[PDB]
Amino acid sequence: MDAIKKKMQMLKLDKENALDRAEQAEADKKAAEDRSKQLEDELVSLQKKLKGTED
Amino acid sequence: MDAIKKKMQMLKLDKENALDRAEQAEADKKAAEDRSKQLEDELVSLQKKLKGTED
Amino acid sequence: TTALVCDNGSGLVKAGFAGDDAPRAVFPSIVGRPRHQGVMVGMGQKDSYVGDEAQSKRGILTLKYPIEHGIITNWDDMEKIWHHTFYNELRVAPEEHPTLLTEAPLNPKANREKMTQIMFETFNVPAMYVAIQAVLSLYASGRTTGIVLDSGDGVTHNVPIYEGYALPHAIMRLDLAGRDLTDYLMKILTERGYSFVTTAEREIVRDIKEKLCYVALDFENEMATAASSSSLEKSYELPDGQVITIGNERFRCPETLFQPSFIGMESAGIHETTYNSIMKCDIDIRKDLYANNVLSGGTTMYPGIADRMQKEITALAPSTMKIKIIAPPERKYSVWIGGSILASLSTFQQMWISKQEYDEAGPSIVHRKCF
Amino acid sequence: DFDDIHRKRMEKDLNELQALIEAHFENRKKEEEELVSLKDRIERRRAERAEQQRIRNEREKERQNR
Ligand SMILES: Nc1ncnc2c1ncn2[C@@H]1O[C@H](COP(=O)(O)OP(=O)(O)O)[C@@H](O)[C@H]1O
Numbered sequence: 001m002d003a004i005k006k007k008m009q010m011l012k013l014d015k016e017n018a019l020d021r022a023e024q025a026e027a028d029k030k031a032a033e034d035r036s037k038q039l040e041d042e043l044v045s046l047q048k049k050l051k052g053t054e055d
Numbered sequence: 056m057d058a059i060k061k062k063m064q065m066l067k068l069d070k071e072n073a074l075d076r077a078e079q080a081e082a083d084k085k086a087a088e089d090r091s092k093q094l095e096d097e098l099v100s101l102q103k104k105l106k107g108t109e110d
Numbered sequence: 111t112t113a114l115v116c117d118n119g120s121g122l123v124k125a126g127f128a129g130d131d132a133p134r135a136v137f138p139s140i141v142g143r144p145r146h147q148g149v150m151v152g153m154g155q156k157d158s159y160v161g162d163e164a165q166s167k168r169g170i171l172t173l174k175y176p177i178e179h180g181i182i183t184n185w186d187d188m189e190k191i192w193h194h195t196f197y198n199e200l201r202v203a204p205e206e207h208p209t210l211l212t213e214a215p216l217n218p219k220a221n222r223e224k225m226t227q228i229m230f231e232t233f234n235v236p237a238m239y240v241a242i243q244a245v246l247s248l249y250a251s252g253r254t255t256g257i258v259l260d261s262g263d264g265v266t267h268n269v270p271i272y273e274g275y276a277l278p279h280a281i282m283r284l285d286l287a288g289r290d291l292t293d294y295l296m297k298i299l300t301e302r303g304y305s306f307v308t309t310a311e312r313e314i315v316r317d318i319k320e321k322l323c324y325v326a327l328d329f330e331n332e333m334a335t336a337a338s339s340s341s342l343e344k345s346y347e348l349p350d351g352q353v354i355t356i357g358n359e360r361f362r363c364p365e366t367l368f369q370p371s372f373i374g375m376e377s378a379g380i381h382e383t384t385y386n387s388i389m390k391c392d393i394d395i396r397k398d399l400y401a402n403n404v405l406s407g408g409t410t411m412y413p414g415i416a417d418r419m420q421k422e423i424t425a426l427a428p429s430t431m432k433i434k435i436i437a438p439p440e441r442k443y444s445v446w447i448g449g450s451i452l453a454s455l456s457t458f459q460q461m462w463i464s465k466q467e468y469d470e471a472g473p474s475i476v477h478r479k480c481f
Numbered sequence: 482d483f484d485d486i487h488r489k490r491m492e493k494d495l496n497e498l499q500a501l502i503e504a505h506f507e508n509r510k511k512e513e514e515e516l517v518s519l520k521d522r523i524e525r526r527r528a529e530r531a532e533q534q535r536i537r538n539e540r541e542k543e544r545q546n547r
Pocket residue numbers: 118119120121122123261262263264288289292316319320321407408409411412442
């Protein structure tokens with residue numbers, strides 16, 4: 001037939017598109033999270049040196 | 056027919072789950088990156104305050 | 111022993127033993143006395159055909175449902191239906207089996223008390239328990255939160271539940287259901303020339319509604335398209351020939367759900383009573399109810415309703431919340447599957463209304479702790 | 482809760498599809514080819530009946546024509 005092929009292929013394409021988009025988003029989320037952790041760690045030391053400067 | 060409809064329904068369940076996961080991951084990325092950039096801005100303001108204290 | 115999970119419903123009686131996947135016997139709940147005279151002698155003509163037997167001899171019967179809107183209006187016929195269900199469709203005497211009936215929310219007390227009195231005196235069951243038809247549909251989905259819209263054939267009710275704690279002040283029961291849609295379809299078919307009047311032909315109109323009607327994603331665009339092209343006109347063959355062609359009656363019959371002004375009802379559609387039921391809940395559980403909206407009941411089987419309802423609620427709800435509509439493929443029997451699961455639980459085994467308890471407090475025991 | 486959804490969904494997600502495909506394949510194989518072959522066979526028998534009817538009708542009309 002004809003309809004089954006096109007509908008099935010389009011739906012599988014939709015699933016694959018959503019999956020890859022989710023993977024890209026999660027990768028960027030993990031990278032941003034680690035960079036945020038770095039920012040926290042540096043900010044604490046910045047606060048400590050600021051406190052010493054103020055003393 | 057009979058089995059074809061059920062197979063389509065399976066292909067649609069995969070569609071919904073993949074699309075929902077993609078959207079949720081995208082929202083997670085947006086939230087995490089906003090968190091990181093706000094932390095970076097806080098770090099910048101701390102640098103400027105340290106500069107004023109140094110002056 | 112095993113429990114009998116009966117589910118009276120209104121339009122289809124669904125029954126079966128606890129612990130299975132699907133009801134054992136599903137048959138319309140109609141009792142039809144013959145109306146003509148009858149000349150053949152010794153033909154073995156009975157005085158009332160009930161259940162699925164009266165859907166085959168419906169040409170010479172006057173079918174009449176014993177349950178109007180959730181409530182039961184004709185107790186003798188309902189007793190006959192129960193007797194048939196126990197003895198001929200399951201063939202298990204009720205003297206050796208607990209029963210788990212189901213009842214719509216906000217129903218009259220006398221109905222429930224009479225139901226338990228019948229089950230304990232006539233059929234003489236060991237123990238029976240009455241459960242609200244929406245909690246079961248929530249069981250079947252495997253959730254524990256969510257707001258369930260159980261649009262049956264008699265009455266549509268919308269019970270919100272969070273973390274297992276039902277919210278009794280947020281139940282919105284509306285009496286528009288499948289039967290009113292059948293009557294409205296039978297009333298708008300007259301605009302093409304087809305007149306169905308007899309109570310037997312209501313079944314034919316019901317079959318037309320089931321097989322052809324669908325819910326439009328956008329109503330005005332469909333009304334405009336059906337009035338220009340002819341790509342919608344689907345034909346259907348009556349039980350005697352003379353095929354009929356349904357035009358824009360296809361999506362106008364089930365549209366009554368979202369605009370109850372069509373049949374003259376004042377209230378708002380099923381798309382807005384759900385949002386109102388949510389807004390009556392507390393401010394901190396609205397996100398979970400938004401994300402876990404559950405559909406159940408027969409009438410929610412129209413092709414394309416899970417998208418129209420989501421579009422409507424997304425229009426009403428705040429833009430940030432995610433709106434998700436759970437529409438399992440086993441929608442019709444969702445209440446009964448949930449009933450089977452509940453009856454199969456070990457923790458539930460001591461909640462039955464034991465017969466000695468009924469003997470001590472009378473039929474008013476059902477409103478007491480054993481709910 | 483929500484942990485039986487896997488054990489009641491994933492099962493039929495593949496087993497039901499495969500079993501229904503098997504049923505369709507076996508039913509088509511059993512039905513279509515056998516029906517077409519049997520109809521051809523009955524058609525050949527029908528043609529032979531037609532020939533026998535023509536022969537008998539002609540011989541009886543030949544004799545009886547008086
Ligand atoms: N496949 C279908 N499509 C559209 N409507 C349906 C379908 N199946 C059943 N219905 C409608 O739902 C009704 C049955 O609802 P049901 O869930 O059996 O009610 P109850 O809650 O009393 O059991 C029927 O009267 C019919 O109008």
